[PDB]
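Retro notes
What went well: the complex prediction finally ran end to end.
Inputs used:
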Amino acid sequence: VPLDGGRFATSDLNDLYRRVINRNNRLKRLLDLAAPDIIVRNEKRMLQEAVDALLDNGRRGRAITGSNKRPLKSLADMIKGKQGRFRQNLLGKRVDYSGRSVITVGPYLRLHQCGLPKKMALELFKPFIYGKLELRGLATTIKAAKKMVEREEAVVWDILDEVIREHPVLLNRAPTLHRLGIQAFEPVLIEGKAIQLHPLVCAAYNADFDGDQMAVHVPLTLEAQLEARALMMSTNNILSPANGEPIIVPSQDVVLGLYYMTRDCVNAKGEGMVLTGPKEAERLYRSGLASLHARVKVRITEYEKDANGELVAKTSLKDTTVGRAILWMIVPKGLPYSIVNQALGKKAISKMLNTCYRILGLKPTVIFADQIMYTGFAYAARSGASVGIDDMVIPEKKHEIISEAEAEVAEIQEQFQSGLVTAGERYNKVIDIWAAANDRVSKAMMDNLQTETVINRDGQEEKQVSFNSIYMMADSGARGSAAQIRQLAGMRGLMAKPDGSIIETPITANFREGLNVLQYFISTHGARKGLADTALKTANSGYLTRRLVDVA
Amino acid sequence: ERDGLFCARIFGPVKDYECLCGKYKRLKHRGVICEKCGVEVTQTKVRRERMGHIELASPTAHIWFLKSLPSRIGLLLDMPLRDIERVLYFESYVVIEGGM
Amino acid sequence: VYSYTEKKRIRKDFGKRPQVLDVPYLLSIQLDSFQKFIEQDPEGQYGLEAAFRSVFPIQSYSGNSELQYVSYRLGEPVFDVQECQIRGVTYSAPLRVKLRLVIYEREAPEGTVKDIKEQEVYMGEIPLMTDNGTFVINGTERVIVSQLHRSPGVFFDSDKGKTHSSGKVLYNARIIPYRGSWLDFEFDPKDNLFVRIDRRRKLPATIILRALNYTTEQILDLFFEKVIFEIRDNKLQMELVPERLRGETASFDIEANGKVYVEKGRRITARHIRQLEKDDVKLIEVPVEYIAGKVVAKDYIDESTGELICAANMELSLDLLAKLSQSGHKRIETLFTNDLDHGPYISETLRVDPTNDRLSALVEIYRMMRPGEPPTREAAESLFENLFFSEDRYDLSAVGRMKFNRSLLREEIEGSGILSKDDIIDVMKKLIDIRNGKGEVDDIDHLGNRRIRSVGEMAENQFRVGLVRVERAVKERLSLGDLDTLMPQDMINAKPISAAVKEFFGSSQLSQFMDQNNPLSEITHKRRISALGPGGLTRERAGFEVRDVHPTHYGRVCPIETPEGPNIGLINSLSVYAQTNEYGFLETPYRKVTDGVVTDEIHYLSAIEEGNYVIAQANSNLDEEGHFVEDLVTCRSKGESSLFSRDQVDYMDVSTQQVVSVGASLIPFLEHDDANRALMGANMQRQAVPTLRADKPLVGTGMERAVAVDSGVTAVAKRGGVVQYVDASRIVIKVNEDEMYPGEAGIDIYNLTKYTRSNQNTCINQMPCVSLGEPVERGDVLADGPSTDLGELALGQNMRVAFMPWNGYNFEDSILVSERVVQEDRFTTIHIQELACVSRDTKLGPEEITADIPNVGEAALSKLDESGIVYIGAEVTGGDILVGKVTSSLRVPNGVSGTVIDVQVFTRDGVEKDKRALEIEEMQLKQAKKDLSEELQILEAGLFSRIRAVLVAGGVEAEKLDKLPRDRWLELGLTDEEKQNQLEQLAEQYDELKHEFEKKLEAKRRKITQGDDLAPGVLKIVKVYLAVKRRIQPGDKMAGRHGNKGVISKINPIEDMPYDENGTPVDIVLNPLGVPSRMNIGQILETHLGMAAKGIGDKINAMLKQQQEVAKLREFIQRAYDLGADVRQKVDLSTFSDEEVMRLAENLRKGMPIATPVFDGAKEAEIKELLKLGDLPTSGQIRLYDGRTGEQFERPVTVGYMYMLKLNHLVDDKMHARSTGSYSLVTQQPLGGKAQFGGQRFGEMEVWALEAYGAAYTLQEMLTVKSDDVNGRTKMYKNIVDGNHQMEPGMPESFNVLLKEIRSLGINIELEDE
DNA sequence: GGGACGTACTGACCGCGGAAGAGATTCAGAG
RNA sequence: GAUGUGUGCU
DNA sequence: CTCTGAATCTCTTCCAGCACACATCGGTCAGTACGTCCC
Ligand SMILES: [Mg+2]
Ligand SMILES: [Zn+2]
């Protein structure tokens, strides 16, 4: 390696070769002068050690004499190890025509196209631009076209839009764990410096928008273009290779929008009226006369495959929600109406898509998922589902249950201090009564949350489901479960220890009120345990998957 | 420098179609070996492709056939590896046709 | 109280628990370490002399060449901090050590012939500690972290359920000295003691005890107990011990009660054990077989023939019975063994031991240490006496001795430094007693078994290593030294000490950069406790026990501050109120609690001492007497949070902030969020980035005041006074009367650091924050640095927030930003990039810096001067040549932009300086003249007033006095007297001071005007600083103070954002579908509190704009500052002023600052009360209106103020693409990294993805054409540029490289056939 | 006039881990 | 350029 | 007079991916020209 300014460094092998040549010359000289046998045997020992150090290192005496505490590199170290020649430059290579940036979300894009910055597109497709320019006669030599694209004329943008119009690309997230780790899309120019990506596709990559970075690759040959558009196209990957369950399941926001869209109340604007079709239903909603969700008699013109591909039209008059009729506008011909009569949670829309692809086909399923995405984000934006401190009501029976449990543990203490039971039995009784108190508090808070809302209906009052924001987020299955709500509103039960035992003193506090230092210091144990588990799980899984992919 | 870790008459020239002495720089010049210090004329990819050797005054054993657990030498001669370490590293003798 | 600087922004807070002890000096760890290290001390208990005395005075073999220590002296600071940091040279200092050299009379008593005492012989150059607590080496700033390791001493360990698939719980001990080799006493699955050197072959542990001059009978009595036997008349028999008899069976029958006792074969209960004393039976009768069923203890010798009767540790047999019967011995002594009380471990291990001689032990030890070596008597003796019986090659510290004595129930903490010949036996007996079932082992989790090594300790260790490695050459030179013909200057070499100290400070495992991008980062990077480095473990060998938290970390180590990743629990952070113990352990304060009175007297407890007392909790009310307001209180004895009686406690915590550190104490409402996101928030507060103009956080924690004071970027008033002159960079403060030194005096001057480069390419500056004609008290702030505001820590900005989805732009975690933010320029940051140049010397010709370079036009060569340097303040773009150099166009790298702000030139002798360097020298000289002249004038006015007042006596006028100059008064005479004598004395002092300042200015000019030293083989060094003005843009990363990260998705017009009924638009909108899942509920209360603060600020601003009277404003401020429950913040605005109230109200127009301590924050009721004080709704949720449709929503939405930040992950610093760039050399493959035109690495796991599909040509051209084919990719490019799309196969050159490497390895390999 | 070892200045030359697999190792059951 | 040193994101 | 089939000591290998910034790659004995303060 020639350093700057006359001087230069050297590799580790050169020292070994110099040592071997020097000792060989010294042995030749000692054979020339007929030295006594001890000297030539010492020289032979030195030469054997030098050859051993050149062929391998770290096996005889770890002799290096290269630098300060740094074992030099040999041919075994060239081939063996993590950074050996194989795993560094044979399997995982480094390829041009690539690039990386930070990803971001974009709602106005279909699931068969992705965003792309302009500078990246201008930098990657330079050969295609040169070819098209010198084909259209806008440049004589390659130097002319190179200087013109360096000057960044206006017409090169048109040339770029022409040459990229129908040229697919590839995307790639750094942790690749399965077949769907690398897919294909069609690029669309977007001003900026960040790659926009389809919302529903992000669920397959398992890549949140907390700053994750992806990579791009451009196929060159025509066969690769065909392989990308046919095999690795995002529209062809709708079912997981592991299980028959789909991969285009809506995750977080559109599910909340739909769940808020299809549910009836006790009294709304314009309840009891009639309507012809969903069109005038949406018209009434946009006019503001009728509320979003109310029981309205409407007529629908559904369809059904009577024969092997023969649709039959029919009419009906059902009692349904205005929002349900509005959602029916994007439903294709083949699906029945009884699929949208329920609350349409997460599993509901999952099986909806499952039955949609099972009957109609590919393109109807794709366009139906697209329309679901658009309308769900629209009505989720128009919903206005916020969160406040009043959204978490704490039942009044919690204090009394905690006082009863305290009386119980005090009585158990007073009984054990006289020697009636053993320590383990006392511990078991205490943990059992605290678990019972936890169950009681959980049932109390669930009863308080799920059905607190009572509203009159033309005089008399009546119970109904609740419209609490946190309850709508929990029940719809968007994020979290019942355990997290139990931890926020009620107590979080008991905690474990690094040993694995359970402390007899439970966490007698919620997250709405403050926590004393002791309970937080205890919960730190479980927090750090989970963090360490998540830290080491990837290090184990990498080697596991590597062995499994190497064995078969 | 003259033939050592790097050379031009043993491994190949530095720049394409240029001898070391500089007396010949031509694309037509092919295989014309010099006369002051005999060096042919070719490109540098042949310098990357060729290979040299080195000689020794005494034979030298190999370490992989020796130290590895399936010791091919040890399995061939049925002799413990420690005694072979002693012999190869000049610690004892081996009776080779010393009279049975 | 409430000084002028502490009065402009009176921060309201909610404090229930009253304060009892303020936060001490935050950097009292590293400064304390270095101070204790560097201070000389006649009592060599520590410091440098404690390291010198071990290596100093020495002696030769017999030549009487003894050099001896007398004293040393610290060298003067050669350079300053600023200029030396600009140069890039270590902030070191000389070390001149005085040494005395004597030579005794040749072969005689102590007759000193010559007593050479060389005056402070020179040696070494050690760096110094910066006032902030850093180092300066090569322009950067290292920070030596505190390494945590294991306490040197003794302990016990328990290998449980490890091997053999059984319940064997074999134990082992370990003696870890401060320096030397470890010693291990381990068991085996066959009940034998095994001793081991560090990690070498094991062997029976009796060998080391045999090697200590002992006899077998002494060895056996030293562990076991004898059994008494006696031949009264016949029928040998053993006496009765009541405790030995306990835990036995009736072999024949127990001889107690004379004749009738427990029947044949029983389990003797305690009743008969007490009967043993009730009938005091000692010795009656025992048969011979039960006696023969055991092993004799001592040896026996025949009385007639003088031969041996038997051997030690031998069981009894009929032949030995016959030999003892015929010999006739009464007193027989055997071993009382038991499977439950006295294990036969010692006797069995001695029996298995094959050797019996001590010389055999020496031979075995020497063979185990150095195999294949001739066993020599003297060599083995020296090795055994040098292994751990020597002072030089073995040294156990006094702390180690203390731990060793405390761990063995000793009393005296004194003793020797090496291991005695009794401690081994002591620890062996202790291990045997532990194996017997008494006591338990100690795991390595208790902080009493850990000790924090500091900077001074490592420095002393490295310096001692240097001394002991130069002592070899010292002895070698003195063995053949000369009589008197040379001084110790030629005897000693200063090379190795400097080499070792530079090796340790520059390139080590603990020395590293510091993050100047954030004062919080600077203060948290120093108070860091690592676990890596020498002596400690590594990043991947452990583990599962050393990563978790132990209940002793409470108050000592922060449980909730660590970088998430491959190192959890190893980079733990130190707490707030923690303090370094004298020994080196961790002390934490506690309040003394008497019977009923909680005295405010504080103490300090170690970790081992806490396990004895009981500690109360700060969450307990009291009233003027320390008595609790409860019947009983929650406490803990040993990790047992339970309920104890009220009149039993011993101590109570100081404050609730004791459990957390500064990295987490700056998070408001921490008591409501889980640690999984509190950790992320504490890291993101550390990874912040400053802005143009910082702003106070409306929701603070109170700690933000005592952070920037002790930080680096500030201006602490050294002495109070009055502001005289402050313009942009220099501050003149007139010194008060009582703060004046005797004799001469003056004023305090300050220089402010302007725009310069940090360690992470971030800007930094110091702006004044005071007005002219204003007093100041000593110990206040004068100039605010980056992300600071009037001595208050302020990281980022703050604005509105809304929790509602909007067209799905907030899909997973994205963040929406309105155009108002980028328009108002509130998140615009500054970046400074440094580019250097070299001018070396080649044999073809010296490298010139001429401004003429061919191949380019006049457009490129237009910004340069006559000397080839770009003009200062020239807008540069990508690819613009900045330095003209010939045998070389050092142009702007492709991607960066901005302007040029400064030029640096470093030259060496041989090449003259251009006009630029001379201009810089003249500017620096002009500044050094201006400041010295200002000082000269401001001090000379005093002497002129003195000579005026002296002239006033006798003869003086008034109007015709100020006309003749002040120097002409010295020219004026007066009648000869002591008055004129004082005039002449003052004139002499004037001339002396003038000449002294002239000499000082001459020296300062000579220091800078002279040449500069630099690296060899290079003449000129040109460093150019570039500055970039970049703002916020999509793709950037933002996060609040609760781990809620996100990437900016889209920037919308102002009107498209929602707005309330008053037309005020809405700022950044987050996603409300993250709170229930992440459980970071603490941010919503912060939002409500910020909304309340802004409402109060709006009321104040309205009442100020309508120009009301001061009484209404005072009344409203009294309304504001008097709400809530019992607090300590109780001010009275009716005492300050009429103008100060106006200034305070003008300062509060942006919003009333509200502080909140961590674990006793304001409750929800007080929040709603403060909301009701304003004009806001109770629930804090207001209707909105869409910018698109203009339609009201269907549910009130929560709004308020969050506290946004800005991180270093800028999108322009990650986006990188490349079509065709430079290639590698050994393998024809592309390069990687944003620099040097790198490309993405198509790794191995990605091949598996394509392998799952059916893509073949794709993978072929992926890893064949675009990667390795030197012949193929050229043809591919030529085909692509011609419209063709025909791929071509080829031969991977990396495969050829592998083939060549295998072939040169010595194995034939080659492609088979055609 | 003047000279020759400091003062650089190079030439070169030798120097806090499992888990498995495979080589030793020893114990006993007799013979 | 190769190694080493850390630091930061997944 | 000793063989072989199982229980133990002892030596060798590996541990996910990506990005960024620093240091170091001949030290020292043996020749080889300039040079300045007394001689
Ligand atoms: Mg992520
Ligand atoms: Zn030639």
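What we learned: Chain C has 35 helices and 48 strands.
What to try next: split runs per interface for comparison.
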